[PDB]
């Protein structure tokens, strides 16, 4: 809904990619000591979820 078509470029409805998705290093956001300092400020759950994706 926020696409801005130009004269030479015309917007087309973008759709979610048609694809199908163990490293698991994303756990560092909640396991490493340095990262965990942020847990009081910002919840790492969304970030780790995006990392899993």
């Amino acid at each position: 809904s926020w696409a801005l078509s130009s004269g030479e470029q015309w917007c087309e409805r973008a759709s979610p990619p048609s694809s199908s998705c163990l490293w698991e290093q994303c756990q560092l956001l909640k396991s490493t000591s340095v990262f965990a300092r942020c847990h009081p400020l910002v919840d790492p759950e969304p970030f780790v979820a995006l990392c899993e994706k």
């Binding site: 000591s33 965990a36 847990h39």
Partner: protein, 199 residues
Amino acid sequence: PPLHDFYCSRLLDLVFLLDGSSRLSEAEFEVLKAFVVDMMERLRISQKWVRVAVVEYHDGSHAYIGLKDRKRPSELRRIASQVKYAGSQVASTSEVLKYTLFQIFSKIDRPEASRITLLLMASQEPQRMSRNFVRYVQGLKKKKVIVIPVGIGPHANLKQIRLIEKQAPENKAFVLSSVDELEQQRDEIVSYLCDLAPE
């Protein structure tokens, strides 16, 4: 003479358990030393009112200041700031608990005050070394001792935390994510300790 705002000038017996595992880096261990120094700075440090003892455990107790020691509080500050960084690969909560139960608090001579142990865990003791953990916690409970676990780091064993609380009415856990939170919660911790004031 309170340095900034607080002076818990009441009969008390206090022991610290600065962790010596490698999980707390050199800077983190220095922050912990700053915590303990700034903590005792706001207490009436004297055998008459407050007894302070720092016991670094790196798989073996390394008591630098004993609760029986009688020296100038400035000297105690200096010693606390001078606690060396062990940097051991594995600490032992059970070992330090046994040390405090048998060799530090086993010869009651001042019931006027209370017994409080600040277990500042920052690493997971191997399960093979946790055979007598509950036994020592209960034994300290019999001796009128309140254990205040502090889960400093993310690796701080949390199963033992709230398990010390489970086997006691007053055992309160202060689970933190980093040593930085110690400065934030210093006032809260000293307040909580002074709620259980022996007067």
